[PDB]
Amino acid sequence: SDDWEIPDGQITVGQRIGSGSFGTVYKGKWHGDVAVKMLNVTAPTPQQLQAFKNEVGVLRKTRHVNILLFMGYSTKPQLAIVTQWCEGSSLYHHLHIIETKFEMIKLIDIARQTAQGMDYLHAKSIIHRDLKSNNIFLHEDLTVKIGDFGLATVKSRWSGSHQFEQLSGSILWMAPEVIRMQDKNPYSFQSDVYAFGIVLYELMTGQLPYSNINNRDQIIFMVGRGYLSPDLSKVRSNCPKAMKRLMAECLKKKRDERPLFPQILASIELLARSLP
């Protein structure tokens, strides 16, 4: 088979963990513990399969301490992504399910490591396209590992060479221009920055945005039109003023007004030092 492709019957597929916006995750064994994500795209055209393999060639070279290790892929019995299995919980589970009480020095450090990993992804010209706290893991309660980046080719089913892109999974982290799906390239470094802005919101508030709105279509419409944005007054009192400012810059409605990650990482690192 092909480079970094795992042949049929090498992964022992174990328990089903759950499914998200574009696949279903299983715990597996393959030279250690792995997560195996069975892609929703089960029936891929030769053009789609080729563009997916080209994308895998990129992703497999993205090695960094804050990036979940890309381990391989399978085409038989079905299309699948094999990644490092994370011990412990995603940041989403810690913040919103376990309600782990982190101190502020450690919230800042989680945001620092995430910005560190995002900085690397963008240095390698990779748009994450799906940053959210479910895709940030606190591995062994220490290191931040960002997962589920790239993979644009399988986040939409293909009709020949053209693919229609539709919103999938949670919308809370999507920039206004991602929601609208109107520009030529809705996804950009800046739309990742926005998503990071929302992650900052979760870290500094303990809450998902739009907690007072239970109508998803109202959120889609109003965020998309720019009429609605996270309530920054839910930020907790011990959040450094500079972190609130950085958050607001990441969440700017107009993508061109958002900073990039070298500047974001530099701000968090400065804040971490000028902090009790």
């Binding site: 759950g18 399910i97 919103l167 919308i171 609208r180 109107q182 279509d217 959120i219 889609i220 998309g224």
Partner: protein, 312 residues
């Protein structure tokens, strides 16, 4: 409730079956077959072995804190009080294996969404009976429980070979609605324009959703954006653009000439963008389309089994 003799007979039989059902436990179910999947859930036909009953079991996987989960399970228990000929019966809601289960009566006709695909288009005289059932279901939920449906659409109107038409998936749990808003997305929407903008006009938005659903079932096609010209004489937009269209464009309408003037007026009154000028439930119940439909003899069970391929 009002209830003809046959409706009170079936309602009583359902309560009788429900007494056979004690506590619902995952081990007591046996999968029969899949009934369908939404964008946040999956529904199976199942046998409840202790009771012998067949039910439809909806499973929802939500990654939520246990306090919120427990509140959702508490709120769903109100479904034990939702007994109406126009409401899908309910057996139980519980949590197990990371999954919220909602166990309801199995409707062998499926949803009107499925039925619409098999029918092509649903005839006006059938749509009259559907409207009566939806109006009456929404009235039951609002008057007897203060419940607002919040998700009226063809896939949530269920039918069966006895000819019953019943509402399901209504907003008995605002916690469940909120958790699902955070976790999934649709590809289309039946949300009213005023709620898209954050304005709350009680059940006026369910009436908007109904009107939209009636247009879709009449013409055989989700009606946002309107059909283009020659498309109509044979008689894909992303989620955000659909919502923007609902808010900023005139509402859909039935084709003229193809449908009675009463039916056209009935859906027009439902689809007024101004939620106060929109008809309410009391006004729809005496609308000419409904008065006419209520007096027509329509073999709804016959038409449904015929459409689906089942026997009588």
């Amino acid at each position: 409730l009002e209830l003809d003799e046959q409706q009170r007979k079936r309602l009583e039989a359902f309560l009788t079956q429900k007494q056979k059902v004690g506590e619902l436990k995952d081990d007591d179910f046996e999968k029969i077959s899949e009934l369908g999947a939404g964008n946040g859930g999956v529904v199976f036909k199942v046998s409840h072995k202790p009771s012998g009953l067949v039910m439809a079991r909806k499973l929802i996987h939500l990654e939520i804190k246990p306090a919120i989960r427990n509140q959702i399970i508490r709120e769903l228990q109100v479904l034990h009080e939702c007994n109406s000929p126009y409401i899908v019966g309910f057996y139980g809601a519980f949590y197990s294996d990371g999954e919220i289960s909602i166990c309801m009566e199995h409707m062998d006709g499926g949803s009107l969404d499925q039925v619409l695909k098999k029918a092509g288009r649903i005839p006006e005289q059938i749509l009259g009976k559907v409207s009566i059932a939806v109006i009456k279901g929404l009235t039951y939920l609002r008057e007897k429980h203060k419940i607002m449906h919040r998700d009226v659409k063809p896939s949530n109107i269920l039918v069966n070979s006895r000819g019953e038409i019943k509402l399901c998936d209504f907003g008995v749990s605002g916690q469940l609605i909120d958790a699902m808003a955070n976790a999934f997305v649709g590809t289309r929407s039946y949300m009213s324009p005023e709620r898209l903008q954050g304005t709350h006009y009680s059940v006026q938005s369910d009436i908007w959703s109904m009107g939209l659903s009636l247009v879709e079932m009449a013409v055989g096609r989700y009606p946002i954006p309107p059909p283009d010209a020659k498309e109509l004489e044979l008689m894909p937009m992303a989620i955000f653009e659909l919502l923007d269209y609902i808010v900023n464009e005139p509402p859909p309408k039935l084709p003229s000439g193809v449908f009675s003037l009463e039916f056209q007026d009935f859906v027009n009154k439902c689809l007024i963008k101004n939620p106060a000028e929109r008809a309410d439930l009391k006004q729809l119940m005496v609308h000419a389309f409904i008065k006419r439909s209520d007096a027509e003899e329509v073999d709804f069970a016959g038409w449904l089994c015929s459409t689906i391929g089942l026997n009588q």
